[PDB]
Ligand binder design. Structure first.
Ligand SMILES: COC(=O)C1=C(C)NC(C)=C([N+](=O)[O-])[C@H]1c1ccccc1C(F)(F)F
Ligand SMILES: CC(=O)N[C@@H]1[C@@H](O)[C@H](O)[C@@H](CO)O[C@H]1O
Ligand SMILES: [Ca+2]
Ligand SMILES: [Ca+2]
Lengths: 675, 224, 240, 169
């Protein structure tokens, strides 16, 4: 019936129920063993691939009884699923399971589209480097065609002489040598046709292995001959012009295209109103603020301890003891003396006692409710407790763990609470990663899709040592494949991993292969895999960087000359020394004596205030409530209304006209700033 | 030198050769000339080879001689005032990770596999020398007829390790550049096992490289 | 006519492309046809413009400056062979000069000409950043000659090709460190060129850190003061 | 009421109520190793060592792990007294001191786990079935139900210049 099939699917218990299977269906691909289809792991995960795939079949029939672009893939994920239970390609398109999540999440629905918009925009510029890549690839075929062959020993210059056996000499020793066959070998990247030449030049544009191609090209001599040492050293000009043209200028004129044309995403709308962006970043702060806590205590015994700690000499003492602990931690080294190994045991018990005494005194002076409310004291409470334990746990070692020694290193981070300019730079970028999580979600997905396909296509290469597929760098588990991919994103000999993955490799013996089929591992799909991954990733990472730089562009052009939130940030602290808690108003006996402490962009100047500061505070618009009751969310609009936005009279409610149309929504308590 | 002579006496005395001094560019010109005669005499009397390398300061007299190149270095130096809070963040981050590495990996990469009875390090033909372990989490040294003993100076002729604060800080700066950082990861795996130390390395390459470059780039965008 | 110049534009490009090693003899000879035929057809599209709409106007276009040198240097090479003067060094240089014939598709883009309109008026601003950058490379290349030239005399048998022995090679070595590519291997050779991993000779390494950090600082003032300030004025000139 | 009566902080605090007992399941059960010579089959733990061929001979001898897991139990004790008292009297700040002890109680099993592995490695095979994967599910519970409770009780990032960390109310 169209009414029980309509209400079950719709609200909340169908979206948090099917998506928690998509996340678990995807984790079933990752947990697969690549080498053996016969594992007891690999058997029992196929029975979840019949447990999920009966549930998503319910999702189709419960949907296709309701109605008559993104659901034709959901029919593909079901149809491949029952089929897969070419068979080799019907396993590979079983990776499309996280793609039905980017339809159900509407935060995901949009960020995939913004990529596709930025793909069509960058296309014309892309054509120009694509034609430039072809122009250079043809120059390289005319320079280096047939010239990247060589022999095993460098004595033999033609293929006809490169026969038989020669001696290598281990450890450079002419007494110690072994016999090997000589062989006429071709360089893996060459300029022999135009298409290989584009592959060689793509590698040099990633900067990977480009001096290896450079010294091969300087040594090139004639067609079908081996290299001659420092033959044509002037062929560095070909490689250096290509790097300046492609790998620098073109790449830059691709990034700076995104930056200016992501400015338009914050500039394609039009604002001919009364108040501009700097009036916007100033008014709304006074509207939407909130007073805060200055946990000033009472009880002059507690105030005797409170006046010590918040003072400058206690902030100066404790930050000069973190410096000396950092120096004592730097002094440790390997094979050190007995009176040196233990003075990092004497002082580290000494530094622990000193920071455990500052934690106690801040409980006693700050009225211990008011200690844990401050976030940098929760961090200091965890360094205290974690370094009490390591002093005990090392003491209990010798009386009868390298993790708890880390707490010692962590105290260094405290120093960043004095630095306002580093902590403001840190917050501004950390929040912008936090605010835009789906742009980074895509990168996670790209790695995930690639790692499952890499395990399916490369996971049976043997881990032989001296090659690029080995115990440290393979596709045989999901953590390993992912790690290998990250290495490539970093571009850390990614083209040499690419060559270790093509056709003709040794399969590991625990693979299922016929006798006489050992070298049948690997595929020449590796070329599409690696280049594509390399290219998808570059787009993904620049996309994320420029989306984060967008978020904080008001800060990245904040122009500290004129005005900023920092004058405003400083103001709250001054106000907070008049309030035990928020409460709205303070007395009036502090409203005259307020204006002596503020910067002349916001307060007044250095000079004699008997003209300006005595009359203008009444002379400007201020609210008129009762005598000693004036509040924080009413002055702080008007207090910056001196610094900018001078007006004429009668139109004080014509402040509130542009406080709705050029403004956002209601801001209900704004009768305070009006009169 | 006669240029430095005819440009103090076309002006006058000491406070007129201070008018030769007040601009910072001629300050560069006089340290070169004095230094130039300071090595050319001490070379003759010693009849110096390390003071010869200061002659490469002479091509910087050519930027004092082109006026349209003195407007760039000023604007080059001007862009460094926005990027100082970043450069102090990068610095303390290399200090954090260097010390952690020192505690965690200090003296750990000193055993390689050798030929039995000998002082000859055993490798495969394309393999570089890496740490071993005996009966633990590391790699077991299984080439052929080899055993591993700990008398080895380390992974790149004894350069890249975490034995003291200076060499730990050089291997961390080298990783933060993204050049050779997976060699150092793989060597630590070889020495002590592959279960934990990727957490050290991936976190450094993500904060110390990628996150740092988003802020440096951001500052550049703000300036331009 | 906007679809029948691309017959010889995409025949010439294709002709250039099929060049490969150990290629058939008919393929080399089919490329003897396309060089003679299309150079005559390159004349017919060019002789019609200088006489059919005015030789004064024909020089006024910027790509019609380019059209003449295609013919004037292409038929020059055919007269260079057919005189007994095949000139074995000039047989492969001039086959890179006819590689400018696939630069004739610039008249077909009409999409990024506001950049090159803009890029062009800024070449007295392009070279002032690129001179002091190349001046920076020269000073570090000569400094590496004083520090490391003559010093890589190892009694190994391995080759250390990025060294500081000549000025051209020293120059090649500095640019390699500026890209970052394998810059630590260059630094490992310079530390072993002094004593090795010991307290005076390890301070070699600060040469390489200053060249990497201060050098790539100039690169981000070069290619970002270009591609922000030269790629926003095109955005201004397109929005006008 | 906003950091202490939100459901996202009580789903986590009930999750710690699972890991408070699974780490107690491990610290009494001695089943996380199998000596297998081939009968001399022994099952190791912290407190008792029992060799089974009934001939059930359980006795003591391991000291490191035992001593280390007094602290893993103890922090669990010291964190809850902060957590049980932070749901009353309108102090949710008090909730903050308590979480730190659940990371520590998490990490003082992970030393224990590493300490028990050495005993089986120095001493014939090894197999863990009942109480290593118990404590490796109470490590991962307490270590990650502690860090998430921390970030579900630290205020956030203001996301605005006006907003301030530890901002009033
Ligand atoms: C087609 O160009 C290409 O082959 C590319 C080469 C040869 N090198 C690399 C590293 C690219 N890539 O995938 O990032 C593109 C490239 C490069 C510079 C600017 C732009 C692009 C562009 F392709 F993204 F446009
Ligand atoms: C010199 C040397 O070690 N030779 C080895 C030998 O020791 C080993 O028993 C045999 C089995 O693979 O292989 C060979
Ligand atoms: Ca590299
Ligand atoms: Ca590189």
């Amino acid at each position: 019936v169209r009414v029980l099939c309509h209400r079950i699917v719709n609200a909340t218990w169908f979206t948090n129920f099917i998506l928690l299977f998509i996340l678990l269906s995807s984790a079933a691909l990752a947990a697969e063993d690549p080498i053996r289809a016969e594992s007891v792991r690999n058997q029992i995960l196929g029975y979840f691939d019949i447990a999920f795939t009966s549930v998503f079949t319910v999702e189709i029939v419960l949907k296709m009884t309701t109605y008559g672009y993104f659901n034709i893939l959901d029919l593909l994920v079901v149809a491949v699923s029952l089929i897969s239970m070419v068979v080799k390609i019907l396993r590979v398109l079983r990776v499309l399971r996280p793609l039905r999540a980017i339809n159900r999440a509407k935060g995901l629905k949009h960020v995939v589209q913004c990529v596709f918009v930025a793909i069509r925009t960058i296309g014309n510029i892309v054509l120009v480097t694509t034609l430039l890549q072809f122009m250079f690839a043809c120059i390289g075929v005319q320079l280096f065609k047939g010239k990247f062959f060589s022999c095993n020993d460098l004595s033999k210059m033609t293929e006809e002489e490169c026969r038989g056996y020669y001696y290598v000499y281990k450890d450079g020793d002419p007494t110690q040598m072994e016999l090997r066959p000589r062989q006429w070998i071709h360089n893996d990247f060459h300029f022999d046709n135009v298409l290989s030449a584009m592959m060689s030049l793509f590698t040099v544009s990633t900067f990977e292995g480009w001096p290896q191609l450079l010294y091969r090209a300087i040594d090139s001599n004639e067609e079908d001959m081996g290299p001659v040492y420092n033959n044509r050293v002037e062929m560095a000009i070909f490689f250096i012009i290509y790097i300046i043209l492609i790998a620098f200028f073109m790449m830059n004129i691709f990034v700076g295209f995104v930056i200016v044309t992501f400015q338009e995403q914050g500039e394609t709308e039009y604002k001919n109103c009364e108040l501009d962006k700097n009036q916007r970043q100033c008014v709304q702060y006074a509207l939407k603020a909130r007073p805060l806590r200055c946990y000033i205590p009472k009880n002059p015994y507690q105030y005797q301890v409170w006046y010590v700690v918040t003072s400058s000499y206690f902030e100066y003492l404790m930050f000069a003891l973190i410096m000396l602990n950092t120096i004592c931690l730097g002094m440790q080294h390997y094979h050190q003396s007995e009176e040196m190994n233990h003075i990092s045991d004497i002082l580290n018990v000494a530094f622990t006692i000193i920071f455990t005494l500052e934690m106690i005194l801040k409980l006693l002076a700050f009225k211990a409710r008011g200690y844990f409310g401050d976030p940098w004291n929760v961090f200091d409470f965890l360094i205290v407790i974690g370094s009490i334990i390591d002093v005990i746990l090392s003491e209990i070692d010798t009386f009868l763990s390298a993790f708890f020694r880390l707490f010692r290193v962590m105290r260094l981070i405290k120093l960043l609470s004095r630095a306002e300019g580093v902590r403001t730079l840190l917050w501004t970028f950390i929040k912008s990663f936090q605010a835009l999580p789906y742009v980074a979600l895509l990168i996670v997905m790209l790695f995930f899709i690639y790692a499952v396909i890499g395990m399916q296509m490369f996971g049976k290469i043997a881990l032989v040592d001296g090659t690029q597929i080995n115990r440290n760098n393979n596709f045989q588990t999901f953590p390993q494949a992912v790690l290998l991919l990250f290495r490539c994103a970093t571009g850390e000999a990614w083209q040499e991993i690419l060559l270790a993955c093509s056709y003709g490799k040794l399969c590991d013996p625990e693979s299922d292969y016929a006798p006489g089929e050992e070298y049948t591992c690997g595929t020449n799909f590796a070329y599409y895999y690696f280049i594509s991954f390399y290219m998808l990733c570059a787009f993904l990472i620049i996309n994320l960087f420029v989306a984060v730089i967008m978020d904080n562009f008001d800060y990245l052009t904040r122009d500290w000359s004129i005005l900023g939130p920092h004058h405003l940030d400083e103001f709250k602290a001054i106000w907070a020394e008049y309030d035990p808690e928020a409460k709205g108003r303070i007395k009036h006996l502090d409203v005259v004596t307020l204006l002596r402490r503020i910067q002349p962009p916001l307060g007044f100047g250095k000079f004699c205030p008997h003209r300006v500061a005595c009359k203008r505070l009444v002379g400007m618009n201020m609210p008129l409530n009762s005598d000693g009751t004036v509040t924080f969310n009413a002055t702080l609009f008007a207090l910056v209304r001196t610094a900018l936005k001078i007006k004429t009279e009668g139109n004080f409610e014509q402040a509130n006209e542009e406080l709705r149309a050029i403004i956002k929504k209601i801001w209900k308590r704004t009768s305070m700033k009006l009169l | 030198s006669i240029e430095a002579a005819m440009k103090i006496i076309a002006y006058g005395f000491l406070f007129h050769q201070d008018a030769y001094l007040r601009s910072g560019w001629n300050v560069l010109d006089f340290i070169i000339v004095f230094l130039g005669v300071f090595t050319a005499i001490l070379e003759q009397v010693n009849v110096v080879k390390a003071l010869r390398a200061f002659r490469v300061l002479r091509p910087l007299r050519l930027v004092s001689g082109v006026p349209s190149l003195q407007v760039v270095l000023n604007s080059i130096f001007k862009a460094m005032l926005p990027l100082f809070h970043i450069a102090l963040l990068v610095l303390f981050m290399v200090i954090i990770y260097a010390i952690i590495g020192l505690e965690l990996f200090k003296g750990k990469m000193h055993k390689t596999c050798y030929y039995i009875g000998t002082d000859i390090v055993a490798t495969v033909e394309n393999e570089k020398p890496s740490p071993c372990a005996r009966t633990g989490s590391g790699r077991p040294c299984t080439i052929n007829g080899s055993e591993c003993r700990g008398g080895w100076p380390g992974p790149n002729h004894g350069i890249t390790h975490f034995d003291n604060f200076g060499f730990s800080m050089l291997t961390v700066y080298q990783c933060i550049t993204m050049e050779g950082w997976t060699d150092v990861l793989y060597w630590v795996n070889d020495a002590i096992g592959n279960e934990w130390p990727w957490i050290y390395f991936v976190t450094l390459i993500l904060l110390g490289s990628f996150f740092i470059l988003n802020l440096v780039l951001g500052v550049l965008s703000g300036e331009f | 006519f906007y679809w029948l110049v691309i017959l010889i534009v995409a025949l010439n490009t294709l002709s250039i492309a099929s060049e490969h090693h150990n290629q058939p003899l008919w393929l080399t000879h089919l490329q003897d046809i396309a060089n003679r035929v299309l150079l005559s057809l390159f004349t017919i599209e060019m002789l019609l413009k200088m006489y059919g709409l005015g030789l004064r106007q024909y020089f006024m276009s910027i790509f019609n400056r380019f059209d003449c040198f295609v013919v004037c240097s292409g038929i020059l090479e055919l007269l260079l062979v057919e005189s007994g003067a095949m000139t074995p060094l000039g047989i492969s240089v001039l086959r890179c000069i006819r590689l400018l014939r696939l630069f004739k598709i610039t008249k077909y883009w009409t999409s990024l000409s506001n950049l090159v309109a803009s890029l062009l008026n800024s070449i007295r601003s392009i070279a002032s950043l690129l001179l002091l950058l190349f001046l920076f490379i020269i000073i570090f290349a000569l400094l590496g000659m004083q520090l490391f030239g003559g010093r890589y005399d190892f009694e190994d048998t391995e080759v250390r090709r990025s060294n500081f022995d000549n000025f051209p090679q020293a120059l090649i070595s500095v640019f390699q460190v500026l890209t970052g590519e394998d810059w630590n291997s260059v630094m490992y050779n310079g530390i072993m060129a002094y004593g090795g991993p010991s307290y005076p000779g390890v301070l070699v390494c600060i040469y390489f850190i200053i060249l990497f950090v201060c050098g790539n600082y100039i690169l981000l003032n070069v290619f970002l003061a270009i591609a922000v300030d030269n790629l926003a004025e095109a955005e201004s000139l397109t929005s006008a | 009421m906003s950091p202490t009566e939100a459901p996202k902080v009580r789903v986590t605090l009930f999750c710690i109520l699972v890991g408070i007992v699974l780490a107690m399941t491990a610290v009494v059960s001695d089943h996380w190793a199998v000596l297998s010579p081939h009968c001399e089959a022994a099952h190791f733990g912290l407190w008792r060592i029992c060799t089974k061929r009934g001939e059930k001979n359980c006795s003591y001898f391991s000291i490191s792990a035992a001593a280390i897991s007094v602290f893993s139990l103890g922090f669990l004790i010291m964190g809850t007294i902060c957590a049980l008292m932070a749901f009353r009297k309108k102090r949710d700040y008090l909730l903050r001191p308590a979480s730190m002890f659940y990371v520590f109680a998490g990490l003082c099993l992970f030393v224990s786990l590493e300490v028990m592995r050495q005993s089986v490695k120095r001493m014939i095979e090894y197999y863990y079935s009942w109480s290593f994967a118990c404590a490796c599910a109470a490590f991962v519970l307490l270590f990650l139900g502690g860090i998430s409770l921390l970030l579900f009780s630290l205020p956030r990032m203001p996301q605005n210049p006006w907003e301030s960390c530890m901002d009033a109310e």
